[PDB]
Design a protein around this ligand. Structure first.
Ligand SMILES: Nc1ncnc2c1ncn2[C@@H]1O[C@H](COP(=O)(O)OP(=O)(O)NP(=O)(O)O)[C@@H](O)[C@H]1O
Ligand SMILES: Nc1ncnc2c1ncn2[C@@H]1O[C@H](COP(=O)(O)OP(=O)(O)NP(=O)(O)O)[C@@H](O)[C@H]1O
Ligand SMILES: CC(C)CCC[C@@H](C)[C@H]1CC[C@H]2[C@@H]3CC=C4C[C@@H](O)CC[C@]4(C)[C@H]3CC[C@]12C
Ligand SMILES: CC(C)CCC[C@@H](C)[C@H]1CC[C@H]2[C@@H]3CC=C4C[C@@H](O)CC[C@]4(C)[C@H]3CC[C@]12C
Ligand SMILES: CC(C)CCC[C@@H](C)[C@H]1CC[C@H]2[C@@H]3CC=C4C[C@@H](O)CC[C@]4(C)[C@H]3CC[C@]12C
Ligand SMILES: CC(C)CCC[C@@H](C)[C@H]1CC[C@H]2[C@@H]3CC=C4C[C@@H](O)CC[C@]4(C)[C@H]3CC[C@]12C
Ligand SMILES: [Mg+2]
Ligand SMILES: [Mg+2]
Lengths: 563, 563
């Protein structure tokens, strides 16, 4: 999981990782070798000035070692970039493939934006931090080990200086610690003291209505005077703290610089000190690198842990697991907030080859009741029958792809061209079938005016009209010739002529197949066969329009309100 | 404005600012003096080791100078904290006082949260950055000047080294420049390549409904392969760039360290080089401080400019500039989005001492029409008459504080105790008047059960019930005994018993004064005198209830729908 899956998916790059490790070791070794050589060169130059024959050979040796260093670092970090990039691409592909299998509960429980952000940016940052750690931590640890070993072989004074160096680094970072403490304390004091202005401006209508602005002024002044006092003591305390930090820090610097040399004096090389004074900068930089890299590691491990936790799950319902359809005592509620119940013992049947509609001002979840047949959510109770067989035993993929077609009140378009976008239900689509379907759904006529035509991309491409988008949805819906059709508010917000055209297209398309339509305007339903009036969860009424007028139930009130 | 106002408001601290400047000069001078002394001490220690009588005096001198440095820095930054804190408090108070004068157009055009953030956090950060710049920039510039002068007086080689130092600093920062370029290029490539997954997950219902997940898989794989290739070339380019940066940087380091010494060799002090090698770290730190401080200055100046731009404005309508009230042909629309018009030639009058109501399912802006008499917004056309005098010539403060009382459907509570919160219309409130008003508005009865009582604070204090909150508002409104009263949905979302109690309280409170009430439920209006039915901007109907029933207009449809 957090480690086993990562190790399994990182296994096929072990050889390249080892080669990179070797290159890093070489680069760190040469980087360790450089500063001592530079110190010796500057020391011999200074001694020659005090009194360049021997400097040329040392300079050439430094140049050769440094060219080797450049080649080694180039090879290392190009290999590291290759490995990290390959790992990132593989992880992105695997995460997308595994996440695409989940049901709707995961999707509507969370948000799409955060999922996309985690899928792309979080894993990119994880890979970046991971390879940066691989480089820097190994390089710096090997640098520290090599320089310490060389200085010890060069005695105990070097070990004492190395031990003292971490204390000096901490004393130096104490300034930044004081800075963050100052910032945090100031922010906390500001948050605690303020709020009166926020409360006053939050409800400005009332404060303007009742006519005073003076009481707020002295209250705000008193609050700011209190925050003012607290600020004086906080600043004074921070001042004393930083002053003590500085005094102690440089007192320790001077004391060490004196005592260590005085004690080590009790016979080393004259130029040994000059060569020793340069490695301090390198070791200090290394410890700073470790200090920052600790935060890099913690952030990266947290990101990787959450990525791998959300990467591999178990689908709630398996995805790969010609007649009438009916319900029986089906009740259901949304998984989130089960207190809001939806279905009170809902029973309904669809005649095999007749038009069925449904209507209600709010219904009590008419759209979700129109759902639940595509196995979007399993029913809490009751049974659903289709062609004499239960939908549970039937494979959901077969029912999705060869039985039920779905039209929403908003169509969806992708960057793929229209010719392939229509070929979306089956990828085995031939040539002439696409044009025939487009002609049947009234899409070939207007697509001619487009300059590119069937090669036009979408959001980043040419924009199509709402009626054109509705026409585009219909051809894809009819490619499979579904036995059951579902329409959700086909008569959306658009003009009258295009609405009539698309209604006629649906009429000549919805022939010989059972189709269920959901409409809000009652003027588009009188041409249907049967009408079901919904109110308060349970079914309110169902029957023919001509008898529904004589019934005088809730439908009479609804049509009176609409008229 | 951006500078003149700042100078005027900073004027009364010039003496303290100058004293701080002097202290900073002293601290910078001693900080300049320290490194040369440390270099001389370490050089003489090394020379003694090569062959501590003279080291003690130099160490004592360093300790004395360094104690002086500590005292100077303490005094400087405590004075700086005092000055900055005083400036911040004064600016906050002035900004609040000036902003509180603005009309409602500013408030509803912008957001309260951003205003509060700018008022508190932006000015706090501005003050912090401003004093940090005052300290660091002066200290570092004086440090650079002093060290350069001392090294020159110590020759042209020092000037050459100082000139070369900025180039080395830039070469060092080239690594961070490459880092930011790498990050930006990677982010841009990720943003350009991605989007297919975002589009697929944005509409998951449709992609799940039409049954395919394969086509998305090869499209996503192709997109990731393209991004993969682009990543290989981008990483290779960054690799070569950083390799060239490093090779050139340390080649320049070695070349300078050789050539400068070789040329300067052509008779300085033997220990001069050791004392010179230490000031390089100080000057490098100073240039780093300037580099960061440039960003601090730009951010601070932007923040201060926006603060001062929004700090002093000109109110749209002046704030300090017994009978019936009536309208005449008053039309108005909201200043933002004038296309959405509201008032179509609205005429209405209020009898002096009778109950008037208004109702509508949406009205066309019934609430904003109920407004516009408190001078919240000036009328576009028409006239408003009150007691035979125009409201424009009358002082808005007098009308706000001694004429009109306002009750909203949501009450507002502050952290101030109830005893003073009731005393909100006038601060001259005596003792017994508050208790009498509380008893009249039915608030003294339930406040007894509270343990603290009239000393109870609110959001951070004890929580009161909705009916209790409504009762607080009636007493506050009753303090001034307004001649005109306005109620907006008194029968809010709450139980029946408390609704009846508060309605009775309003009835025994609304006696002898003209009051206008807005209600949504028609069951609370039949007891009024006259009813005005609103529909589609213009006035639809007005008259008595008993004749409105016989009229059979839109009121009949509304009451039929409600029933
Ligand atoms: N994905 C969801 N997650 C949680 N709650 C939901 C979800 N979808 C719907 N609901 C809630 O369940 C209620 C009923 O479901 P729904 O079928 O969407 O109502 P509806 O009246 O048919 N929609 P409409 O056609 O716009 O009037 C809704 O009012 C929502 O509050
Ligand atoms: N402060 C505002 N800024 C911009 N637009 C506003 C503002 N207030 C209201 N509007 C718009 O103007 C319309 C009419 O004004 P308003 O009086 O608030 O409607 P209303 O029907 O009386 N409100 P309600 O009592 O909840 O039904 C509203 O529907 C808003 O869309
Ligand atoms: C770049 C950093 C992280 C390297 C680590 C060494 C740092 C922490 C140490 C070494 C020398 C120190 C500086 C020496 C001079 C004083 C002057 C005083 O007015 C403010 C603090 C200041 C400026 C010190 C801040 C901390 C300091 C910069
Ligand atoms: C022969 C032996 C004793 C030589 C030992 C010399 C040691 C004790 C002295 C000589 C110069 C000193 C360094 C001068 C610069 C500072 C920068 C600070 O950020 C960390 C400590 C550090 C890096 C000091 C560490 C100790 C130091 C290295
Ligand atoms: C703390 C900083 C800002 C001080 C300024 C000097 C910096 C920019 C210079 C001085 C010495 C340089 C380092 C010398 C060693 C190499 C090893 C290589 O594998 C990565 C870059 C790296 C690590 C260089 C990075 C930049 C560098 C750190
Ligand atoms: C007598 C005269 C010529 C002495 C001149 C010595 C000069 C040329 C040499 C001696 C040691 C060198 C310094 C060694 C450390 C680096 C750190 C880097 O981040 C900036 C440049 C810098 C700071 C070098 C600047 C030039 C330098 C100061
Ligand atoms: Mg719905
Ligand atoms: Mg309103």
């Amino acid at each position: 999981f957090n480690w086993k899956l990562f190790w399994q998916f990182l296994h096929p790059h072990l050889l390249v990782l080892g080669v990179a490790v070797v290159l890093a070791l070489g680069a760190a070794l040469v980087n360790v070798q450089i500063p001592l050589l530079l110190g010796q060169l500057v020391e011999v130059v200074a001694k020659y000035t005090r009194d360049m024959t021997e400097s040329q050979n040392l300079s050439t040796h430094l140049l050769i070692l440094y060219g080797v260093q450049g080649l080694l670092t180039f090879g290392y970090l190009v290999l590291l970039s290759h490995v990290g990039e390959r790992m990132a691409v593989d992880m992105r592909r695997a995460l997308f493939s595994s996440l695409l299998r989940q049901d709707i509960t995961f999707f509507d429980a969370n948000k799409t934006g955060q999922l996309v952000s985690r899928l792309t940016t979080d894993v990119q940052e994880f890979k970046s931090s991971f390879k940066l750690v691989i480089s820097q931590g190994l390089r710096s640890c090997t640098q520290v080990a090599g320089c310490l070993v060389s200085l010890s072989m060069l005695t105990r004074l070097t070990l004492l200086l190395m031990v003292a160096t971490p204390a000096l680094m901490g004393v130096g970072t104490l300034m930044g610690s004081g800075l963050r403490k100052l910032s945090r304390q100031c922010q906390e004091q500001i948050a605690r003291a303020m709020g009166v202005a926020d409360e006053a401006l939050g409800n400005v209508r009332t404060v303007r209505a009742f006519a005073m602005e003076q009481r707020e002024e002295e209250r705000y002044g008193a609050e700011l005077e209190a925050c003012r006092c607290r600020a004086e003591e906080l600043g004074r305390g921070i001042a004393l703290f930083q002053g003590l930090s500085n005094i102690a820090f440089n007192c320790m610097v001077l004391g060490t610089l004196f005592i260590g040399g005085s004690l080590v004096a009790g016979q080393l090389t004259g130029g040994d000190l000059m060569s020793f004074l340069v490695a301090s900068q390198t070791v200090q930089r290394s410890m700073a690198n470790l200090s920052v890299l600790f935060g890099q590691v913690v952030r990266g491990l947290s990101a990787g842990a959450r990525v791998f936790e959300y990467m591999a799950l178990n689908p709630c319902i398996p995805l790969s697991g010609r007649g009438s359809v009916t319900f029986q005592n089906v009740c259901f509620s949304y998984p989130c907030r089960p207190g809001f119940e939806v279905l009170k013992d809902f029973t309904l049947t669809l005649p095999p080859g007749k038009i069925v509609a449904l209507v209600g001002q709010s219904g009590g979840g008419k759209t979700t009741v129109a759902s639940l047949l595509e196995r979007f959510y399993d029913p809490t109770a009751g049974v659903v029958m289709l062609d004499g067989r239960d939908l549970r035993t039937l494979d959901p993929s077969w029912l999705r792809g060869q039985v039920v077609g779905f039209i929403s009140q908003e169509p969806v378009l992708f960057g793929t061209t229209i010719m392939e976008n229509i070929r979306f239900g089956k990828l085995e689509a031939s040539d002439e079938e696409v044009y025939t379907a487009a002609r049947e759904a009234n899409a070939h006529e207007f697509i001619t005016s487009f300059p590119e035509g069937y090669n036009t991309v979408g959001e980043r491409g040419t924009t199509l009209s709402g009626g054109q988008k509705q026409r585009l949805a219909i051809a894809r819906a009819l490619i499979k010739q579904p036995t059951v059709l579902i329409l959700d508010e086909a008569t959306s917000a658009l003009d009258a002529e295009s609405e009539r055209v698309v209604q006629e297209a649906l009429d000549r398309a919805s022939a010989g197949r059972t189709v269920l339509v959901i409409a809000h305007r009652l003027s588009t339903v009188r041409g249907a066969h049967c009408i079901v009036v919904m109110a308060d969860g349970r079914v309110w009424e169902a029957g023919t329009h001509e008898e529904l007028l004589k019934k005088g139930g809730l439908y009479a009130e609804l049509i009176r309100r609409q008229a």
